[PDB]
Ligand binder design. Structure first.
Ligand SMILES: OC[C@H]1O[C@H](O[C@H]2[C@H](O)[C@@H](O)[C@@H](O)O[C@@H]2CO)[C@H](O)[C@@H](O)[C@@H]1O
Length: 369
């Protein structure tokens, strides 16, 4: 099954009947030239959906869903994961270089929608009843829905059970636990310091929290240069007892054979760690020629139990926004911890200046080194 745009036939029949060069035998060579150029042009290629998703999510699982959508409709589906896609998209979507569907945490999506780059989505009232209502409220900008909520991500504390059978309950006791582990050739805690998404849970429980984090670097309990790749390698080789990450990382820990748990983030000054909750969402490019087709792949293929499961087997989503699948998924204790850290945190805003917010928080952490 291969589906083409209806305009390709229209252009092709108009090219034959309406052309003087196709009417008389003297000009049949021009007629063939013109028919050949149209035949190879993009308009007469098979209709495709391009999807952008971050390279740490289950794009391989998402693509199997796309191959089923192609088995049922002939609309090819191409999933890509270009780097820094949340910054390539606004530079590229007005022209014809953007995807038909973009996946990102709901917070970048306000800047896009204010710039007119996302189409307003049209779910039925019945379809919306299948998702948790606080997730629709996150993908709403100026009273308009601008994306489909996929998953609810929050950071969790992840600990190696062989090195720390009981994870700490407070941040303030991590120095003491580090001194013990360092004697065993280990360390207590590594996590990505280069992304403010990861430090904010501690800053938000602002002056004293960033201080404690700085006093952790200064007392040699952590390294200022530790980024995502450095922390995951240390944890997945059992060189550190705790890390801070989200559900996407569970896949790589299963293969390393670390006996790991997932639990609430430790408290600071007696209060819960308040991390930023992002709703992973699918937005439809306002420059897409197949907006309606993108609505059907998302409402009828992805956002069903089977579709979310095919993504989740690749890289776990954590807690999904679809109620039917979250009542099952939440029996898993890892997802329960994620839902606990989401409860005790705050959902991030989707203002257009959010990007500048993040720049400020990133730069304040780095320069505090
Ligand atoms: O670095 C700040 C960052 O925070 C959030 O991004 C997260 C994202 O939600 C997760 O999917 C993870 O995979 O990537 C980021 C952390 O490295 C915001 O959504 C994003 O706008 C912001 O840049």
């Amino acid at each position: 099954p291969v589906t083409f745009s209806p305009e390709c036939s229209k252009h092709f029949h108009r090219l034959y009947y309406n052309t003087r060069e196709c009417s008389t035998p003297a000009y049949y060579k021009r007629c063939a030239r013109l028919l050949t150029r149209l035949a190879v042009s993009p308009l007469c290629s098979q209709t495709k959906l391009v999807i952008w998703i971050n390279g740490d999510k289950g794009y391989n699982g998402l693509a199997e869903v796309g191959k089923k959508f192609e088995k049922d409709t002939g609309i090819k589906v191409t999933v890509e994961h270009p780097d820094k896609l949340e910054e390539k998209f606004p530079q590229v979507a007005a022209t014809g270089d953007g995807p038909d569907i973009i996946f990102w945490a709901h917070d970048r999506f306000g800047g896009y929608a204010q710039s007119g780059l996302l189409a307003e989505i049209t779910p039925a009232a019945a379809f919306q009843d299948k998702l948790y209502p606080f997730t629709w409220d996150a993908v709403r900008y100026n009273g308009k829905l601008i994306a489909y909520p996929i998953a609810v991500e929050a950071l969790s504390l992840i600990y190696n059970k062989d090195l720390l059978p009981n994870p700490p309950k407070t941040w303030e006791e991590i120095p003491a636990l580090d001194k013990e582990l360092k004697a065993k050739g280990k360390s207590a805690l590594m996590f990505n310091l280069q992304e403010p998404y990861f430090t904010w849970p501690l800053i938000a429980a602002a002056k004293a929290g960033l201080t404690f984090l700085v006093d952790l670097i200064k007392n040699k309990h952590m390294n200022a240069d530790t980024d995502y790749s450095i922390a995951e390698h240390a944890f997945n080789h059992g060189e550190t007892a705790m890390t801070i990450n989200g559900p996407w990382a569970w896949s790589n820990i299963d293969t390393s054979a670390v006996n790991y748990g997932v639990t609430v983030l430790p408290t600071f000054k007696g209060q819960p760690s308040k991390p930023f909750v992002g709703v992973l969402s699918a937005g439809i490019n306002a420059a897409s020629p197949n907006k309606e087709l993108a609505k059907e792949f998302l409402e009828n293929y992805l956002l069903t139990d089977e579709g979310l499961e095919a993504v989740n087997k690749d890289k776990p989503l954590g807690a999904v926004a679809l109620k039917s699948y979250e009542e099952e998924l939440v029996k898993d204790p890892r997802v329960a911890a994620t839902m606990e850290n989401a409860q005790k945190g705050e959902i991030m805003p989707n203002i257009p200046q959010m990007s500048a917010f993040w720049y400020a928080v990133r730069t304040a952490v780095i320069n505090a080194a």
